[PDB]
Ligand binder design. Structure first.
Ligand code: J5D
Length: 225
C-alpha cells in the first residue's frame, strides 16, 4: 500500500503535525464531519490517483451507475482524437483505464481495486490516461476556459507543460476540467496553517458530491463522510 493506504481514523493524522495549535484545531473540527481517511503518495500525481481511486470505489455494487459510466468512458477516445492526440499513442493508457472500470463491474471488491491502484505500472497508466483526458477537455473548450478562468492565459502551452507530463501539480483549472470530463462531483476540504475557518469548494458548484478530498501540505488525501 505504498501509493494509496488502508483506511485510518481521521485523528491518526494529528501525528503528522505534532504540537501544532492550528493544525490540531482544524483536524479536530474535520473529525466531527468525517470518520476515516486514506493517505496518498506525494509524487506530484496524487490528485489524479486519489480522484480516480475514490470515484471508482464509490461505484462498487451500483449497476446503473456503472453502466452509465462505462458508456461515457467508451466515448473518451473521440475527445482525445478531436484535440489532436493519436490513437496509437493513447491506446495503452485508454486500455488500462477501461480495464479497471471492467474490474469494478466484474470483481466489485475494494481489495482488488486497491491492488490495481497500488501496482506502480497499472496505477501510472491510469494517471497518464486521466492527464491526457484533462488536456483534451481543456483544448476542445479553450474559449470556455479563457472566458471563465483567465482571458490572458495560453491554453496550448499550459496543457503541454502543466497537465500532460507526469508529476505536474494541479490547480483549480485541472480539477474543474477532469470533474466535467467524467461527470464526477467532488468536494475539496482545505486545511492550511492560517488562523482561519476550515472551509471547502464543490466542483461543480451546487452538486451533491460522490468524492471528498482533503488538501493539506500540497497533498490530496481521501475522506469518508
Ligand atoms: C498531490 C501530490 O502528488 N503532491 C506532491 C507534493 C507534496 C508536497 C509539496 F510541497 C509539493 C509541492 C508537492
Amino acid at each position: 500500500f505504498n501509493l494509496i493506504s488502508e483506511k485510518c481514523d481521521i485523528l491518526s493524522i494529528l501525528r503528522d503535525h505534532p504540537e501544532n495549535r492550528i493544525y490540531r484545531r482544524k483536524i479536530e473540527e474535520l473529525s466531527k464531519r468525517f470518520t476515516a481517511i486514506r493517505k496518498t503518495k506525494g509524487d506530484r500525481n496524487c490528485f489524479y490517483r486519489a480522484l480516480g481511486y475514490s470515484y471508482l470505489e464509490s461505484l462498487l455494487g451500483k449497476s446503473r451507475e456503472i453502466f452509465k459510466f462505462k458508456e461515457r468512458v467508451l466515448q473518451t477516445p473521440n475527445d482525445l482524437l478531436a484535440a489532436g492526440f493519436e490513437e496509437h499513442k493513447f491506446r495503452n493508457f485508454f486500455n488500462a483505464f477501461y480495464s479497471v472500470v471492467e474490474l469494478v463491474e466484474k470483481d466489485g471488491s475494494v481489495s482488488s481495486l486497491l491492488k490495481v491502484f497500488n501496482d506502480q505500472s497499472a496505477s501510472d497508466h491510469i494517471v497518464q490516461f486521466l492527464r491526457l483526458l484533462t488536456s483534451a477537455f481543456i483544448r476542445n473548450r479553450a474559449d470556455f476556459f479563457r472566458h471563465f478562468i483567465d482571458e490572458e492565459m495560453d491554453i496550448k502551452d499550459f496543457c503541454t507543460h502543466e497537465v500532460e507530463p507526469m508529476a505536474t501539480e494541479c490547480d483549480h483549472i485541472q480539477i474543474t476540467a477532469l470533474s466535467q470530463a467524467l461527470s464526477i462531483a467532488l468536494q475539496v476540504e482545505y486545511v492550511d496553517e492560517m488562523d482561519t475557518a476550515l472551509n471547502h469548494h464543490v466542483f461543480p458548484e451546487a452538486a451533491t458530491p460522490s468524492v471528498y478530498l482533503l488538501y493539506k501540505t500540497s497533498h490530496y488525501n481521501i475522506l469518508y463522510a
